[PDB]
């Protein structure tokens, strides 16, 4: 019948927070 | 000893330590603070799943339903896998 779904949503990123 | 702000939610960190955060409103990721005379984090969703199709971040073992592209219902869980992955069943 149906195998698993596997879904990804992999991300990163940097931000300052002192101006 | 450096901190990171977050001036939405009015807190601080030192480097090294980890919290997590709200991020385009739905998603949620874990930041840390790096420092480096800015503030500066690093923050990844590779821990949590953030479904596009609901809108909502879910943590690992946490599920949800929702539907395929045919009328079937699948059963989804988070299972995080160091790769922001979760797995459904249709």
Known sequence: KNGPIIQNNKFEYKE???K | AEKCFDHAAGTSYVVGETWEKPYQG?????????????????CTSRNRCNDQDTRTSYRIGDTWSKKDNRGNLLQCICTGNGRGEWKCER
């Open chain 2, 26 to 42: 739905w998603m949620m990721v874990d930041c840390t603070c790096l420092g480096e005379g800015s503030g500066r984090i690093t």
């Open chain 1, 16 to 18: 300052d927070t002192i």
